[PDB]
Structure 1
Amino acid sequence: QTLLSSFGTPFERVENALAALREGRGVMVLDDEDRENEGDMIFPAETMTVEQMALTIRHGSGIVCLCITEDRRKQLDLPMMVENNTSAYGTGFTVTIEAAEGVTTSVSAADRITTVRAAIADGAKPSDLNRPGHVFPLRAQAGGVLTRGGHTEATIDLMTLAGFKPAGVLCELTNDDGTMARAPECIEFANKHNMALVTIEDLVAYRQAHERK
């Protein structure tokens, strides 16, 4: 029927993504069903393993981001990277971070996981993170995808709907030749690694219908 119809109806695709996150698997997030659009891999920040971080560095851009809420950004006392944000999407990059303890060169998969876990910990303090670093936090807008339909918001919204703390790891899927993976390559990669697939349009509609009354 549609490009993603084999993964369920729009609302089924959301629920399947939630089930995947709860089961320790990844999720592939697309903007819509345009076959020329690209996709991001996402994992819950709480449960992401070193192997999953290794997979993300190996097949992603390597610019592995930590989506967090505004209250977490305030708890970590992380300034936004630029006051006058001139990026095309208004991406909410904060200052970059490194775990203050337990890392060496900080770019290994284990070291980035150590940094992610320090940032999202219950009781995390600003002194638990050095700046700058090699993990890139992204601050989601209040309201999630109902305010801004970005991957940052979609990531957070999916984590809370799955029952996790509002924090997720994301990275863009990259072909081995340096080009970015478009929708058919994203679908094949997700089938190969047992990841669910959902669009941001699916999630917007899901949240609008479920939060009404």
Structure 2
Amino acid sequence: LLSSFGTPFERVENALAALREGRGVMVLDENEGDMIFPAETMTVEQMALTIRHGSGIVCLCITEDRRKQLDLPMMVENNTSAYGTGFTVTIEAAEGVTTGVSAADRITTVRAAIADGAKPSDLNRPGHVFPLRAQAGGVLTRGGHTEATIDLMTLAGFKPAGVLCELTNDDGTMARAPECIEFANKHNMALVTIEDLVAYRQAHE
């Protein structure tokens, strides 16, 4: 499917180069493709893009360290979700936003959460940005898009914080693999799969 885009390891390398250039990455894993960007570089336009063509449940993948720094509890005590998704309580920047919902507000909230020296008070809760706490050990622990996001950010030289959202078709169905490729090509995003990244990590372990 992506072979035309290079071997698995080239795909990973290509994704890291895209991230370093501030572009997004379409990470594939029933296909689910997530658009991901580094939290440090994501722009208002990229956020608008993600709301318009994504599920609109735009998530901020963070480490357990960061979660604890922000004093953010996990959303539920007893996670009964099918995949054990690491949602914490939701967040909104305590300053610089109005309703929290616009692309510029969401990006404001992301930036507040990821800032060096960010404190709990910098964020009100609940809000319209959804932090996901990535499992320690990344994709080698849990082959989820959350873990893929953090691993790609750290491999690319960024802070371990990234933004993801599932690509959705206008008709409400989730974008199929070829549809993800089309979108990636159209928006200058690299394409990689979670399996590619797991393989890359295992080879470099």
> Shared topology, TM-score over 0.5?
yes
- 1:18 Cα deviation after fit: 0.1
RMSD of aligned alpha carbons = 0.5
Local SS of the residue matching 2:46: helix
Provide the secondary structure at the position in 2 that maps to 1:73. helix
Deviations 1:4-34 (A, max 9, x none): 001100000000000000011100001xxxx
Task: Tell me how far 1:38 sits from its aligned partner.
Answer: 1.9
Q: Deviations over 1:146-168 (max 9, x none)?
A: 11110000000000000000000
Q: Deviations over 1:100-131 (max 9, x none)?
A: 00100110000000000000000000000000
* Structure 2 residue matching 1:181: 3-state secondary structure: coil
Match of 1:174 in 2: 168
Provide the C-alpha distance between the structure 1 equivalents of 2:19 and 2:4, rounded to a whole number of angstroms. Answer: 19
1:60 deviates by: 0.3
TM-score with structure 1 length normalisation?
A: 0.95
Q: Deviations over 1:165-202 (max 9, x none)?
A: 00000000010111110101000000101100001000
**Following the alignment from structure 2 to structure 1, what is the Cα–Cα distance between the partners of residues 161 and 5?**
25
For 2:129, the equivalent position in structure 1 comes to 135
Looking at structure 2, the residues matched to 179 and 53 of structure 1 have their Cα atoms a distance apart, in angstroms, of: 20
Give the number of equivalent residue pairs.
204
In 2, Cα distance between equivalents of 1:191 and 1:176: 18
Q: Secondary structure at the match of 1:43?
A: strand
Gaps of 5+ in 1: 31-35
Displacement of 1:43: 0.2
- In 2, Cα distance between equivalents of 1:166 and 1:157: 7
Q: Which SS does the other structure have where 1:101 is aligned? A: coil
Aligned partners of 2:35, 2:48: CA distance in 1, in Å?
12
Secondary structure of the equivalent of 2:170? coil
CA distance in 2: counterparts of 1:185 and 1:4, whole angstroms: 12
Deviation at 1:140, TM superposition (A): 0.3
Alpha-carbon distance between aligned partners in 2 of 1:110 and 1:6, rounded to the nearest angstrom = 36
Please identify runs of 4+ aligned residues in structure 1 that moved more than 4 A: none
Give unpaired runs (5+ residues) of structure 2: none
Which of 84, 90, 114 in structure 2 is aligned with 1:90?
Answer: 84
Deviation digits for residues 21-58 of structure 1 (CA, Å, limit 9, x no counterpart) = 0011100001xxxxx41200000000000000000001
Indicate the percent of aligned positions where both proteins have the same amino acid.
100
